Design a protein around this ligand. Structure first.
Ligand SMILES: O=C(O)[C@@](O)(COP(=O)(O)O)[C@H](O)[C@H](O)COP(=O)(O)O
Ligand SMILES: O=C(O)[C@@](O)(COP(=O)(O)O)[C@H](O)[C@H](O)COP(=O)(O)O
Ligand SMILES: [Mg+2]
Ligand SMILES: [Mg+2]
Ligand SMILES: [Mg+2]
Ligand SMILES: [Mg+2]
Lengths: 139, 482, 482, 240, 121, 121
């Protein structure tokens, strides 16, 4: 399956040209980019691995693509995403997040069901990739 | 002769008898507003022959300390401090008999943390007053000191997106249809499909509570199965606004506790439950890590007309104070009343950290929001993916676009309905960010047609509802154009 | 070609696309109303070019099962049964563009015992609809089967009089003034005096909740001292409506439990608390042997104008269902909007065991009340003992006449204010029973002057407010005169 | 070579290392106080050779958002907003080594209706700072918007006087003595005596709670007999 | 109440400092003493032989619960046994307490999954 | 069908709550527990997502004879009102009294949305 986290995962995978234009948008709005890797595609995996610090002082879009490219050359098979962070009062949060890289084959998830009281079900979403292998060799 | 006669008050102000409200301490053009005052803007239509300043002195009087005749018990209190002062009366543009009345109320007149107490003073009686043929509450300046007594949103826009892990587009949703009739099992079917096909949320309809055709527990359990199935199938956080609206506060809580027990990320409530049930469930939502969706049922009974009632922008402020996370605030281009610039003003009220006088949007007062969280506006009601360019233009980024008929009415099924909406949404935003002039009548629809060549569900949708608009003369209009 | 295309519904009704609501099953002139249906009368103003039957089919549709486009999920339900049917459209007299729409809703669409659920369907969205420029809910026929799910009044008129031991006149009362500012100790002073001088009740003002100048416990304790002192001084049951209106249901209950603990015969709540807090506290009142006074704060925001909102007569029905014991329902001759025959219709709704079509009073439907108890109407707002002949004429026997300014504004003190009102009341009723033509402009005022020769407080009052009337053009008027 | 090194922050404010508090945003003499700010006045005695304005800036930093070294995580917040601001440093009369320092704290720094949180920020750490040999909190300006979150007195002077039915003189009282040793029954004796003879209140000594010589319930029951006895002897509201 | 109650404000004394106290065995036996204590703490942690390790999260104030959970995960994953809230981080407009707690727990358990150590904040 | 029938409503509730706690889809009750307990536990079943099976124990003491008692059809109505999900209503061909037309009457009372005069049933 296609992991549909990120905000452009219903379009086809973004070319580098398209990525740069979203990075450009983000930066013209004054926002700070970073790059993150995981190979635990769980919906509740909040903290993907930081590819260095966020690029706070950076003015040129090309610098962020250069880092995305270096993440791609150095990270193991998995997901990478770019996020735009807005440190303005009353935001102080991420405001854009899209997937820049995904594995060729994502097996996805199954729904694990434990009987609670009465008819209630204790659900757990389980990852095929993550249960089979540890971090760094799941795809 | 008797003690009563000898001790009668003989002063001008406190002899017994009626005197006009403008002589009673309720009018002062020279009055300097304090940072701590509560301010109201009233649109007053005096009865013929009633003095416009006397109409505003009356409203001010009867919304604070006054009654119809003079009372000596005023002198047992610090009466000069507790009186409201009407402090400015402007004519409405194009009315020789409708006026804008600004009235300042002292901070200490209001119970801390209490919408009910605020509204008792402010809307309690003055709208039934015979001296006035019409009265609309247009705006309020809730001072920073009163705001800090309120929670504000339980969750808020920032934390909401953090819980969903969803940033950069608007959020998506749909109302389940038909409105009523569906069994709990079939409700879960619609929710699964809607979420699997791409929607972030679905919702129970506002009138779906607990009924002979479907009792609420069946809905909740079958919907959680649908929700988790959709989340497992996509790797996204998913949810459906479980309606916990009930007759009693005891039944609401019961439904809300059950929703939490089974892992629902969100619940919904209807505005008809009323302010005190709303403040309680908004505290309950902060304390139980729940998103609180407010459907605005009954709002347009007092909010639709220009001449009388409460403007919706005021309800937005009061609902953000109380602490709901979502509130429906219009579409512009859908089936429900929504003048473009009024809606923008509403959205600004719900989403900004402070407000600046902006008369075209109906923002009559400047107002700090005291770091109360931001309320997510919801755009529901007769909208389709065909109008995505318009929605993105008028509504911005932080908003839930909801597509009931525009998902479930799709011929190829509900999944296809959903997928069409999301491709539309995503392709459009991608193009906004690229710098394209998307709100152009030529350009926007072509962005959706381009996206539609690799998405057959979206070409189906564009062709099915191409013709559909709801162009009718709006009644809740602005007084200052453009 | 694909499974989606091959299984598309091709029928007229269920092909995808918009069709007018009148073709969707929401119009049927030949429809026979069942005893169990819920009926609504809507005053509809269509937008220009909108077909009046299509406007009523839409309201019916959108208040029951329909949305803007066609949904296949209708076929998973017994859709023919759950649709509302608009079944009659009449023009309004003197409007070539405003119409009366009667719509029948199936009993099973409604959650048992739930005002919130009823109002979600009935007022939820249809008032924001762009297709309609204006919409007033005018009457409802709550069927006997739905009524039996509700408690109705906690106490009711019969038992209320039994608890007071007070029969044969109207009951008497007063709002404490000024509205705000007074300390708890001084509140108890006003209550003692008002009751000692003759009033049955006083009340907290609607905006008296808990504030910096007086917190609610101080009021409650000092008032019970006042109440019992007055009861011991006269040998009558006495009380004061302790306002338990608060921000949260938890705080309301806290105040209501405290009121009970200290022996208050009665509590009050404001309508701004909203329907779900109201249903809960009305159950709580039956279970704790308490009179429940409903002040109607905020009502005139949706109720004042002829063109749009909810008629107050509908609120009366809904509030009697929920179970409040008193509700303010107008004066006619006071300072607040009150057309004579509309007010009589309201009073009939609150006080009768069934209702008969009576178009001059705004009673559009015949309606059994299912032996739900009778709600006591309250007449408050700018009335004085000078108008006793009028009040007795327009309002009848079972009613609380309240005199805030008309008690406390009395120069010789509050006792004298009270005593004047009661002598006025009693002398007038005595004369009604004797067969005198008391409502005559000559006769009535002379009955009060005759009584005033042995009562100096009443001669003072008659002479102080002789001049006072509130004659202004009423906006909530009837469509059928006399 | 590495992503860590290529993405190291290179600005004057957020490069790693130690810079004076006065240059981190915690000193600003031109700052205009908002009515919503919490303000504090400190009598700062800086260590010999420490700059007065630097010590005031340190107190502002370490009672708001600072630590001894620069942190990139400042840039995940609206860090300019949350920083307290020493906005005034003045000399103290008849001293050249002690200074008055006025600091300003954004309203949003403090949990609503919590003395514990206010005093965690304002007094928590800064009194034990080596850079300053002494420090005294002299006064604070608790803004209107913070106060409306707090209850203030349960009863107050006004309502207390109403409950007692005494107005026009100061109220009267006495601590029961000896401080420790008395049984509950004798405690109530003393309470009866002093209330009957004219006192409005008596009181338990601060260190009278519950001990082998007297357990708290015996004191309370015996006192209520004394109180009510005095009240019936006098026609007055009384207490202990 | 007895020992520091009044005496430090007495006029006859210009200054007064309580330097030490001898709490007698008999009084001490009425008290619980540490809830867990050094010995049992190390046992629950499975860490004996070196001083334990921690860090206060920074900046003191302003961080959202999300970012707090980030700092906690990073620090714990890099070798720390603990992180902590700052003394003045309770619950504030910028970050309400439930958000911090939930986000830190994710961070903590992620750290322990990555290291095979008991972790906390 | 885990039988929660007991002497006291306090014991019925322990046993109902236990059954829910351990995951049972259904509980049973006996008609000998009587109407007030039944209506109470029928409200309980709704509240607790439980099937409620009603064994009709003792019914035949008043339902067997034509001349005197209460026809079981009335009991079906009363028990359908109270809110039991199952009730025993007859076999025709088994070991307990059951004329075919009376049984079909009972089954229609239990299962139809409306009834129409049908004298033979
Ligand atoms: O009841 C309905 O019609 C809706 O479900 C929309 O359904 P569709 O998506 O099928 O139109 C919403 O409740 C209204 O939009 C509420 O109006 P508002 O958002 O203005 O409060
Ligand atoms: O606030 C007031 O003005 C009153 O206290 C009347 O005081 P007076 O007796 O001094 O006029 C009542 O709350 C209103 O009558 C309510 O209106 P209604 O009864 O129409 O709801
Ligand atoms: Mg709806
Ligand atoms: Mg009032
Ligand atoms: Mg002492
Ligand atoms: Mg610290």
């Amino acid at each position: 399956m296609r992991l549909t986290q990120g905000c452009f995962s219903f379009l086809p995978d973004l070319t580098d040209a398209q990525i740069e234009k979203q990075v450009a948008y983000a930066m013209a709005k004054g926002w700070a980019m970073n790059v993150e890797w995981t190979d635990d595609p769980h919906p509740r995996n909040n903290y993907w691995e930081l590819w260095g610090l966020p690029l706070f002082d950076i003015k040129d879009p090309a610098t962020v693509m250069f880092e995305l490219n270096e993440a791609r050359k150095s990270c193991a098979a998995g997901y990478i995403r770019i996020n735009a962070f807005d440190a303005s009062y009353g935001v102080e949060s991420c405001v854009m997040s899209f997937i820049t890289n995904r594995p060729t084959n994502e097996p996805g998830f199954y729904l694990d069901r434990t009987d609670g009281p009465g008819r209630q079900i204790v659900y757990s979403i389980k990852s095929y990739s993550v249960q089979a292998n540890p971090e760094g060799s799941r795809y | 002769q008797s003690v009563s006669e000898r001790t009668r008050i003989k002063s001008d102000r406190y002899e017994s008898g009626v005197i006009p409200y403008a002589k009673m301490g309720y009018w002062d053009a020279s009055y300097t507003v304090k940072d701590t005052d509560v301010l109201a803007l009233f649109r007053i239509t005096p009865q013929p022959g009633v003095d416009p300043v006397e109409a505003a002195a009356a409203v001010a009087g009867e919304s604070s300390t006054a009654t119809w005749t003079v009372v000596w018990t005023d002198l047992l209190t610090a009466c000069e401090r507790y009186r409201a002062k009407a402090y400015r009366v402007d004519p409405v543009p194009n009315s020789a008999d409708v006026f804008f009345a600004f009235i300042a109320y002292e901070c200490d007149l209001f119970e801390e943390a209490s919408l009910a107490n605020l509204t008792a003073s402010i809307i309690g009686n003055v709208f039934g007053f015979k001296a006035v043929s019409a009265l609309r509450l247009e705006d309020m300046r809730i001072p920073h000191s009163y705001l800090x007594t309120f929670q504000g949103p339980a969750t808020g826009i920032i934390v909401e997106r953090e819980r969903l892990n969803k940033y950069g587009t608007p959020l998506l949703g749909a109302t389940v249809k038909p409105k009523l009739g569906l069994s709990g099992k079939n409700y879960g079917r619609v929710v699964y499909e809607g979420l699997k096909g791409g929607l972030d949320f679905l919702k129970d309809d506002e009138n779906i509570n607990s009924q002979p055709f479907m009792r609420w527990r069946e809905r909740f359990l079958n919907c959680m199965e649908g929700i988790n199935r959709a989340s497992a199938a996509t790797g996204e956080v998913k949810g459906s606004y479980l309606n916990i609206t009930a007759a009693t506060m005891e039944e609401v809580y019961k439904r809300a506790e059950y929703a939490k027990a089974v892992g629902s990320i969100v619940v919904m409530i209807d505005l008809v439950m009323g302010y005190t049930a709303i403040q309680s469930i908004a505290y309950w939502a902060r304390e139980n890590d729940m998103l609180l969706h407010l459907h605005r049922a009954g709002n347009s009974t007092y909010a639709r007309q220009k001449n009388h009632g409460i403007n919706f922008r005021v309800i937005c402020k009061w609902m953000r104070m109380s602490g709901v996370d979502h509130i429906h605030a219009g579409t512009v281009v859908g089936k429900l009343e929504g003048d473009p610039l009024m809606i923008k003003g509403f959205y600004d009220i719900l989403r900004l950290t402070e407000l600046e006088v902006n008369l075209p949007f109906g923002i009559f007062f400047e107002m700090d929001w005291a770091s109360l969280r931001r309320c997510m506006p919801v755009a529901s009601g007769g909208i389709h993916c065909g109008q995505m360019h318009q929605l993105i233009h008028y509504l911005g980024d932080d908003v839930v676009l909801q597509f009931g008929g525009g998902t479930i009415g799709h011929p190829d099924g509900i999944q296809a309905g959903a997928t069409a909406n999301r491709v539309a949404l995503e392709s459009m935003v991608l193009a906004r960010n690229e710098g394209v002039d998307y709100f152009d009548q030529q350009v926007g629809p072509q962005i959706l047609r381009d996206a539609a060549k690799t998405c057959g569900p979206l070409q189906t949708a564009l062709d099915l509802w191409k013709d559909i608009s709801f162009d009718y003369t709006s009644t809740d209009t602005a007084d200052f154009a453009e």
